[PDB]
Design a protein around this ligand. Structure first.
Ligand code: A5P
Ligand code: A5P
Lengths: 256, 257, 256, 257
């Protein structure tokens, strides 16, 4: 099934997670052809500033994600930052997410694969599409079976990311490909939000196995990625649109 | 609104090659009535990498060949100019005067095209930020151009590589109609190539543009220029049908500028 | 001899040219080991804005440059923008300059070579160093004998240029290499001026055949490139510095 | 001020390789008394492209080998950490804890290095703008680091290529001492390579930095990692003499931060 990974950027509170989870559950009931995966980070490990919000800890995070999976029966995904976190997180995460900056850390990938869960690696901003082949192989070596590669932009000069859509067909040669519509338009360190929907449309017209989107009831108040999180109320309309585009465009997806 | 499809062989190899592609384009224009087709071919490749590559058969010959195409098929014409003096003679036959990517900033060339009264299509330089096309349009308006197009053809990304930053489509749409060049955007000046033409063109129409530009040739492998990226003529119909379908389903979601 | 190409960006007036020419003449007398070339554009053919200063015309420009060469006996260089301008300009220009954006225009290069003068091509911002081989060959084909390639930065994301110093040894394989210290730090369309001297030092430590620098009595009032033109009073100090660095570093210039 | 030269084999292939390079570095430290030499070698290559490449002989083995070097030659030591828990044991022997380029933003790793009391050298990420290293330094100061270095090792430039934007040297100098990594800056992740090490290092000292980082190996072609860019041990002396000479003549022109 087509994948839609969505949720608030950071686990600001179990409350926020349950509110977003409700809406995702509802959409889950509405779009049965789509496999929804609830996503949220228990820790923002590389905020620019030491004074910025990181989170409430792994334990509290796994707990809240457990509440979401229990209350709504939704699959879960969260990102790990050091090898030791793989196991505890795998208790609740159906898919373990590997941060873009850490996509080359062999030990992190192996610890993810060992848990037996699915692994979704965010393609580093410094990484060429063809060089993700080795990332996938490390994971296979470590016993991984369900492997995803997520396109999230590429370093383009300073404080800018460009999305090279040629990467989708290239990465598809060795893994299921996910398009990160949120982080692909943010400026590291223009007008971010206005480009999220247009690029999402491009991703499905080109061909991918799923889309990743951060969403918040009130993006304006988000403690992380405030400028790019999609207002929860707009999620349905966007999903309906990509399914329609996908339905027509899929006829032309090149074999691979 | 009528979607624009600019297509044709990269270079005017002969009047014969032109009439051949022209006939196929004429046929598709009869089928895709919702599309405005414009026949394209350069009378001169003014910046081949090597001094030993094919340039063309001259301005006079090119214009005459292009005139034959318009005459025989009733097709609109577009070709590119390389120096100011060429605008006048070229405007005799060209409905749209094209400005090469490297020359998108040359004021005199822009003014020369503008005062002919013809439409003007500027290829966005590989070095140019989407927001900096605003002044290129201003120059044209200042020069008398009433119909202006900006063509997305990729941006310098490291050495011998171009990337297409699709954010440029809605940015440039603020001041001109936008065309997506499906051929030159996948070329490696000096990823691979042809295998990416179709997927990137699908992305372009999903994002939203006013037209697409595609070089096509009966036998790409024998073309005297851009043999690697020129689309096989027989594949044109399918590509066009596909983009009209994607455009239609995506259209209700195009943002308002 | 080591080359130093300097002068005001645009021929704002014969007056300005003579004032800058005087100082350049003086430095010419002071640094006999250096071949000074007076540079100034009779036309700024690609200003961002239609309302910006372009110049006073080719005729007036060639006239003023003639006054400089006559009054101070300094060699001359100016840039052409269309093929027809090569011949009239070659009457006074010892070196014909090919704009960076036009470095691939075969007809412009051939018209430059035909005049018999020296040709200095500004490496396009889109051009890889190894791809300048073909530029040089076009010129040789057209009869050019004294050929220079000028490093002036490379497109690095939007509105930014980076200087890849690997380009100097690479281009030296087929032409004399000049480093443009002025345009290499400007932001197309950070803090420009503060980086001019540091990068100039790098260029000579690496190894080049000359340096290109725009200078103005009062950069602040320049009608073109106001933010990057070097104050005339600082030129001597910079030249003395690059000669000293060159004297020590030249011992290590790799053979080629 | 004492110029820093950080050098050594890329990976701790064996305690024997270490003592060999160590002896040469000890010898140069006796000749170049105006230089502070720091012996470098990774106990682990935590991010080889392939799962089949050499990683190392483990933390315990590495630290012990590095300790032997410090013990036998009285040389300062530096090595890189990959996870927070490694900072403490590594600080036992390392005078400078190095933070890998890809991890330059990992707050916990930075804090872990900072609280050891050792000096900290951060490799500037290939994705990081020079001005964004300011917050990396802030994190370290916050964590207790009193001696901080930022290492220039190139920036992503298209695919499989890095460019060195020398404007970064004076920018980063605003908040930390700066080191130029002569080895990794010419590497093509995943121009050519070794032929550019020396020229770029000359540019670095002409611009101005507080030290240079260079991987050297008795026989580069046999190294288990970075064989292509590791400098032949016999060439180290000459490279160092050359940069001290260029540094000296350029020094009076170094701008004040
Ligand atoms: O094939 P070479 O000779 O490199 O030429 C490339 C160009 O002619 C052409 O693709 C470019 O679009 C022209 O501006
Ligand atoms: O040679 P491969 O396996 O590609 O590895 C590159 C890296 O180990 C190394 O050069 C990089 O500096 C490590 O961070």
């Amino acid at each position: 099934k087509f994948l839609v990974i969505a949720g608030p950027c950071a686990i600001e509170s179990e409350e926020l997670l349950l509110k977003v989870g409700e809406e995702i559950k509802r959409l889950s009931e509405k779009f049965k052809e789509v496999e929804f995966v609830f996503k949220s980070s228990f820790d923002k490990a590389n905020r620019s500033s030491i004074h910025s919000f990181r989170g409430h800890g792994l334990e509290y995070g796994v707990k809240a994600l457990r509440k979401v999976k229990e209350e709504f029966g939704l699959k879960i995904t969260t990102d790990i930052h050091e090898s030791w976190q793989a196991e505890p997180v795998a208790e609740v995460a159906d898919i373990i997410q590997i941060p873009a900056f850490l996509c080359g850390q062999t030990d992190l990938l192996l610890a993810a694969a060992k848990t037996g869960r699915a692994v979704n690696v965010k393609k580093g901003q410094f990484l060429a599409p063809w060089d993700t082949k080795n990332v996938v192989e490390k994971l296979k070596f470590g016993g991984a079976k369900e492997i995803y590669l997520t396109e999230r932009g590429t370093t383009f000069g300073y404080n800018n990311l460009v999305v090279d859509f040629r990467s989708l067909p290239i990465m598809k040669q060795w893994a299921k490909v996910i398009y990160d519509a949120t982080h692909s338009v943010q400026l590291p360190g223009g007008g971010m939000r206005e480009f999220i929907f247009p690029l999402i449309r491009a991703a499905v017209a080109v061909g991918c196995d799923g889309v990743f989107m951060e969403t918040h009831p009130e993006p304006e108040k988000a403690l992380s990625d405030a400028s790019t999180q999609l207002p929860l109320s707009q999620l349905e309309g966007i999903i309906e649109a990509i399914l329609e585009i996908r339905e027509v465009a899929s006829k032309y997806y090149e074999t691979i």
